[PDB]
Design a protein around this ligand. Sequence first.
Ligand SMILES: Nc1ncnc2c1ncn2[C@@H]1O[C@H](COP(=O)(O)OP(=O)(O)OP(=O)(O)O)[C@@H](O)[C@H]1O
Ligand SMILES: [Mg+2]
Lengths: 250, 384
Amino acid sequence: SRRYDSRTTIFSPEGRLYQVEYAMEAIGHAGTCLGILANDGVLLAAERRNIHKLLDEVFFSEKIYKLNEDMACSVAGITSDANVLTNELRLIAQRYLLQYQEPIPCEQLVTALCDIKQAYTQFGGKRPFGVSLLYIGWDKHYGFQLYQSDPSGNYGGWKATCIGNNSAAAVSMLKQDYKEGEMTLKSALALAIKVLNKTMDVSKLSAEKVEIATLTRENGKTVIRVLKQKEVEQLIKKHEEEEAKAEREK
Amino acid sequence: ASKLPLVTPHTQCRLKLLKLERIKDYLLMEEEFIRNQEQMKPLEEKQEEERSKVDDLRGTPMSVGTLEEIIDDNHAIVSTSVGSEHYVSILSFVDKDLLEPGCSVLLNHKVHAVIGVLMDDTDPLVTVMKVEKAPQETYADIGGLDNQIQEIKESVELPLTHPEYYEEMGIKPPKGVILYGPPGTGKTLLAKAVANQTSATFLRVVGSELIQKYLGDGPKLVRELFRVAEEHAPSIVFIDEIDAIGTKRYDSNSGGEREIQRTMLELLNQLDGFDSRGDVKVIMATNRIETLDPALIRPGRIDRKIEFPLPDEKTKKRIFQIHTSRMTLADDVTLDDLIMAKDDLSGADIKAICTEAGLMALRERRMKVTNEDFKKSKENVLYK
Ligand SMILES: Nc1ncnc2c1ncn2[C@@H]1O[C@H](COP(=O)(O)OP(=O)(O)OP(=O)(O)O)[C@@H](O)[C@H]1O
Ligand SMILES: [Mg+2]
């Protein structure tokens, strides 16, 4: 019977293991997501993959998942794998809320998830998840926060990160265009439209091909608003105006 | 021709004078010794008389033959070019020492008797696999490694240049040297500086081209290869990319891996055979060190195991300095921003960026290389 066993848990003779590196190999494909903030609010930009003309285009989101009433995540990887993870940590937030009667610190939520993801990587003889994701949310301790999961089971605190197909190429411009605490949530918007303009090999920036979520702090709301497709394209052409004069004056 | 091998005083001494004076009297003895033979035995010219007597023995239609056996009393069985072999005899001007089975000889037209032997027109492959000249610059071109270079001179060059050190130690040099690491890490590049440095007969073979479509043609190619390596001199056999025999399967091979296996077995003989090996060194290089048979990697077959790490950033700037040495660098650039652009860039990456940037200047007919050349250059080189 052990002939059929594949040993998805042991190490390589070079010390590492290959399975999660195949997973993080797969996470480089099939999706393009990023997040950015410097100020009140935090934005998520996700490129839609399925762009066939016969889609009912419902459920309010594609890779955007409202977790708590003040935090949300954008996901990347295998969708069907992700769906268990979404509602999975969702009632962990709810059992926190039941346990303390309080919303959860976003970071300690993320750690608690990354334990579970870490466990399959660690034992069980179990195929892990090729799913990585971002984290937006607000707290009373640090306000707006930004975090990044890895399918390995470790995470990262950031402010603005793309895990696209051309993710490092985006990041190269992300550390070429930013300002610490001052990129307000329109400057980061037009910055972001440039970023997805860059890594978008499909040019002309189809407003239906992308998704953008916002998380602001209203007084007792923490308004998380996915803006409609009536105001994407004005930001698109708004980028298109400044790029024409900006090229033309050179 | 090899008259006196002794030079050992090496000064202005009456020793070295009396040497020649003795050998002076002997060579004059040979002169006037042979001088009387034609003085009292003219009888011929002896410079061409006996010579054209030989050439009046042998006919002008000199058929080209090939040996297959030897009977000592100057007759043997010799194969014709048609194949219908004979049992002719052998002459006295045949200088019967250069006679091995399969050699080309000279036969009569009439009785096909073994007139003479034939020097063999080398071999097309010997030249093909034989490296002629030094490829490029010395070890100063590399930079940054500086430790395993001492290892390579240690196992290779120092045995050549100083065969005193092993003898005062009571020791022989290490046999087999292997090179492994990430790709593009200068593995072949070091071997070029070795091929610069050495005077030995150098051979180079890719591990990919060992495989054949004929059965046993691989191992036969091995056997004649080590024949070629042994028969020449202090020789350096290099193999690149020996993993490719195990990685890729090709449908040109009639056999599967159970012919590849036999190839590796015959090679495995040629590393550690019971026969007297001789002065042939073995340098190997690949990037997938974990994949092949460790039986080839045993001490006795390979003694020295050499990894090539990724470059650290202070070595990176040196490699930039090398690949930016002779070029008209416009002072717009800063190399240190170019260092940390990729965390794990190779030495091939730097030269790729530099050369591609020169291509960008030659798009605009310029002579010096500006900053945006590098800006869009790493966009070309890295991100795709
Ligand atoms: N340390 C270095 N200093 C200068 N140039 C380097 C260095 N490392 C690599 N290069 C450049 O990279 C090129 C590739 O070198 P080489 O082919 O020897 O690397 P390799 O590891 O053998 O590559 P491969 O893995 O494809 O066989 C060389 O021509 C060389 O100019
Ligand atoms: Mg190479």
